[PDB]
Amino acid sequence: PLSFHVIWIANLVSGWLSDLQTHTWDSNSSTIVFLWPWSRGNFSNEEWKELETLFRIRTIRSFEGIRRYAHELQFEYPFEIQVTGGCELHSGKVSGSFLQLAYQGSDFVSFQNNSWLPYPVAGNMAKHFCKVLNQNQHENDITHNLLSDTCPRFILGLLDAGKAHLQRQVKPEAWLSHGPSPGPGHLQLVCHVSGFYPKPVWVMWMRGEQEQQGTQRGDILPSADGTWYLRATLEVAAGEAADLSCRVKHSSLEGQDIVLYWE
């Protein structure tokens, strides 16, 4: 799922290619910082200056609008606004865009095509906020242009620019283990699959070729170098594990599945 997105927190702004952070903001100089050489994508130095400026102008006018309507709406200091915005590419289809705003920890208002619509949850207070945000349609057009035109042109150049890093295949390292006991008389079997890239992986407990349906995937867990770590578990009774095995499938393996036996 090829997505690029930006997040604001109100102060930190950053750019993410899914779980991978690619851009960070420097307020000390009002410039965009590139975490990877290829973070520049297919944009030029001129164009990045323009975008630097674009964000600065807009980031300010925006968070100054809140302060402008601070009393008119809700709760005053301290406050937390979270914003996420971006695009996703689809093979064969039209690209997605999103721009969403949360008031404290809950959905507030979001941008749909060319205007702002409230969430029902946020009730009447968000309604008033959208009459405010939608009064100048030209401002909305710009938002639209960035979301549904700028962003997709970028994410293409960006994926292209970092192919040698994103198209990288890192083989996983796998081992078996006990987990904490589910209960009396029973074992939790754990299959650890560690250090792999990219994220999609298939792990399953197997008595022969019969997939065990009780196989539980845990969270996919990150480490600093961008690789992933995943535990697949199965709760079996004490004498019923001798003929079980964990099978790992991955793109790096190129056919050759990892098969571990409990034995």
Partner: peptide
């Protein structure tokens, strides 16, 4: 890592 959040805003 730098601070970030999921879609449920956590």
């Amino acid at each position: 890592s730098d601070l970030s959040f999921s879609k449920d805003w956590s």
